[PDB]
Structures are given as C-alpha cells and as structure tokens.
Write a protein that binds this DNA or RNA. Structure first.
Length: 66
DNA sequence: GCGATCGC
DNA sequence: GCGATCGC
C-alpha cells in the first residue's frame, strides 16, 4: 500500500497509487490524474516528495510508444 | 511557461 | 476556448 499525499485547491489529500491513472512530468513536477470515487481527480507533487512507486509509474508512462 | 486535465 | 491548477 503506497499512498500519495498532496494538496489540491488548498485541500489536503491522499490517493492510493493503484487509483492513479495518467502520470506525466512538467519540469521537476510529477503530475497525475486518479479515480476519485467516480470522477477524475488531479494532483501533483514535487519529484522529491514522490514515493518510488509514483516515479516507477512515471518511468513507465515515459516509455509509452502509444 | 512547461503537460494535461477538469469544469466551466 | 480558456482559467485554474500543480512545482519550479
């Protein structure tokens, strides 16, 4: 169980990596979308605060050749 | 301004 | 179509 904790719209949050859908990099920012009980949530963390699991997922997304 | 998306 | 949003 790996939970990513982040702030969005001032709201503190925590999402389970298995709920994370897309992950991408924007500079040093790791951004993603996730299943938020029915809707698509958005969140991002600094690469430094990203657990290895999230970086693992980012590396996998970065290898996508479609 | 970068990526990408949601919610207008 | 675009602002807000996230870290920097």
């Amino acid at each position: 169980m790996v939970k990513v904790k982040f702030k969005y719209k001032g709201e503190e949050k925590e999402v389970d990596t298995s709920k994370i859908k897309k992950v991408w990099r924007v500079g040093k920012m790791v951004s993603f979308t996730y299943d938020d009980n029915g809707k698509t949530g958005r969140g991002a963390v600094s690469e430094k605060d990203a657990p290895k699991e999230l970086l693992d997922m980012l590396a996998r997304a970065e290898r996508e050749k479609k």
